[PDB]
């Protein structure tokens, strides 16, 4: 066969955060209304994140019941998981019942589990509490995928085209689960890039079914994983650290980032679309990986994309902020119902090849190939 | 083709200790000497362990630089992260290097590499680390396997299966790299199971290259990966846990784990022969993880295994103590080996087929069936 996603489903927390109205709030809950030239610097980079809202597990009532999660490095760790790890796998069973749901199979036909999660590590994980929480049966096989950062979205779809296609009959169940739990913090002039993750990450999770012999009389493809690579980008060491440390995890930003990745994707781009014959660009359909606003604008200038080849990407993040290794799942979920509702000939905007970034750590670009289904 | 194990090689570093002489020098670097009666309950579970001798990077000189990883729960999470995640990938490359040689084949031939530990989480993760180190190629697929625990390298060979079979000459190099940076604590009254950590775990790495289509005018295939199973034992919920928390890993273990494994290890064995149409578990040969003794026991009490059965399980647990993921293969190596010197028939004590056990949180059991190779 040939994996093939089935359904799709998210989930956010109810509590969302107006992202014109943040500033104001996250410099008043940390107490650090006299750093005023660092307020004006976050109001430039919420303004610039192009992010209109964000949803977010940590309240205002969460936070004042945490004050060393409001400080710079406050001794933290053990307050973010004891929130986190019970949110993960929570958020994850919501939008898990629901792809189940429009898959419409018995849960009991689920032989396979991939959960991905950066926010928080756990023995046994969250494969396992997720298991327990949906009644999946016992011997489904599990992989549990931790820490590895705003890429993992594309690292599951690779993951999963291996697993479907080497086990005949199999339905991998996928659960990406994302929260700023582990990295809200205080600001602090020395690390104006923590104050990046802080205008930029949320929370969410999706859900989707994938199998390689999809049955016509009960299952209805969505997208066709055709090919996934993943590559390390030349001279960018260092460029994004992640560090999970006793004031939670710790991000640290170099100014180069946008620049390595849209020097570099063209070299994605030419490798995945060479064996298929496609050199056109804008002649495919784009999900991209969409938490580094300036990521994006390089690319597209780069490529010379047309301006509307990222609507979805670009969409998502408006409305949902970085999520993290969900991103790119939400950003497959408004793509097929946006086709569906303006009548649009396939899945992926009437085009029928498309391209699926993942951008993270490493550097790392994780690139899958997709095909789109009709109407 | 078909997941076949093409080489496999080990690393430990320098430092041991000997296990007949651990409980004077545990109790006495934790400042705990005063606990007589605890230490002699330590005394007891070191003598019970079956261990000779553990390696170990913590050193006495590095443990008086951190006073705080020697109380039972001191903030210390910083420091062993500082100390674990440079070792884990350190020791991981000596154990690949080591595997790459014997392989014989240029390292720009590997196309996928997993690494797997639950020694300490960073963010781009020690797959990363292990690439640039090496100098493979950027674009090496790379599945980051973090805090499994001891089921792990059973689900590196599960998931090496999928990887090498679907895709067409593909080498995956896979490492296990474990520690007791995260573990090591000083002692508790009223945590004896942490205790039961003190007195088991221990440091080492192991390293394996895999492939589907082995080419025997360059290759020598050592074991084949004919099937591989996970599941979760009825009742067990809450058996085995492991926080990471600003004390560290803390571990948590229930007094009916060993009784768990050995009541349910049949069904597992059912589960896995019965395609193949075995039922005499003496006619197989035996990889099973063996970081919990009893366990051991117990399976072969139950199961009315032949004396010898365990004996390379048993061995690799005497002379390296219970280094969680990498036991199994270190019990891989050392079986190849013996069969190779005591002119056996095949890398499986003479037999034809074999079953590798994984036993770790959850409960979870993976298990794997081998086919040995002839001479």
Redesign the interface.
């Known amino acids: 066969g040939l994996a093939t996603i089935l359904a799709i489903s998210t989930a956010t927390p109810p509590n969302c955060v107006i992202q014109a109205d943040y500033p104001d709030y996250y410099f008043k809950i940390t107490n650090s209304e006299h750093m005023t030239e660092l307020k004006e610097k976050f109001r430039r980079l919420c303004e610039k994140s192009m992010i209109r809202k964000r949803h977010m597990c940590l309240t205002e009532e969460i936070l004042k019941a945490n004050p060393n999660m409001c400080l710079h490095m406050g001794?933290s760790?053990?307050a973010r998981?004891d929130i986190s790890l019970v949110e993960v796998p929570k958020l994850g069973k919501e939008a898990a019942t629901k792809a189940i749901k429009e898959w419409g199979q018995p849960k009991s036909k689920i032989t396979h589990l991939i959960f991905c999660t950066?926010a928080?590590?756990?023995?046994?994980?969250a494969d396992?509490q997720l298991?327990?929480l949906l009644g999946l049966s016992?011997?489904?096989?599990?992989?549990?995928?931790?820490?590895?950062?705003c890429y993992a979205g594309a690292?599951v779809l690779?993951?999963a085209?291996?697993?479907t296609?080497?086990?005949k009959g199999s339905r991998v169940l996928i659960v990406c689960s994302e929260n700023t739990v582990p990295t809200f913090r205080g600001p602090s002039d020395t690390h104006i890039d923590s104050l990046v993750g802080q205008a930029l990450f949320a929370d969410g999770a999706a859900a989707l079914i994938v199998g390689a012999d999809p049955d016509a009389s009960i299952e209805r493809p969505l997208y066709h994983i055709v090919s996934?690579?993943?590559?390390?980008?030349?001279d960018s060491?260092g460029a994004?650290?992640?560090?999970?440390?006793?004031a939670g995890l710790t991000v640290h930003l170099k100014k180069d980032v946008p620049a390595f990745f849209s020097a570099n994707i063209e070299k994605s781009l030419v490798?995945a679309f060479t064996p298929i014959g496609i050199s056109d660009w804008n002649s495919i359909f784009w999900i991209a990986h969409p938490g580094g606003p300036a990521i994006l604008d390089q690319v597209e200038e780069k490529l010379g994309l047309r301006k509307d080849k990222l609507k979805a990407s670009r969409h998502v993040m408006s409305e949902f902020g970085n999520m993290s290794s969900a991103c790119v799942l939400f950003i497959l979920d408004e793509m097929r119902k946006t086709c569906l509702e303006e009548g649009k000939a396939t899945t992926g905007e009437g085009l029928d090849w498309g391209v699926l970034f993942g951008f993270?750590?490493?550097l790392?670009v994780e690139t899958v190939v997709l095909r789109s289904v009709p109407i």
Do not use: C, F
Request: charged share 25%; no cysteine.
């Open positions: 001794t760790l053990n998981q950066s928080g590590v756990d023995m046994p994980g396992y298991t327990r016992p011997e489904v096989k599990r992989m549990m995928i931790y820490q590895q950062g690292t690779r993951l085209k291996d697993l296609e080497n086990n996934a690579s993943q590559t390390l980008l030349p060491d994004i650290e992640g560090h999970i440390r006793e490798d993270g750590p490493g790392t």
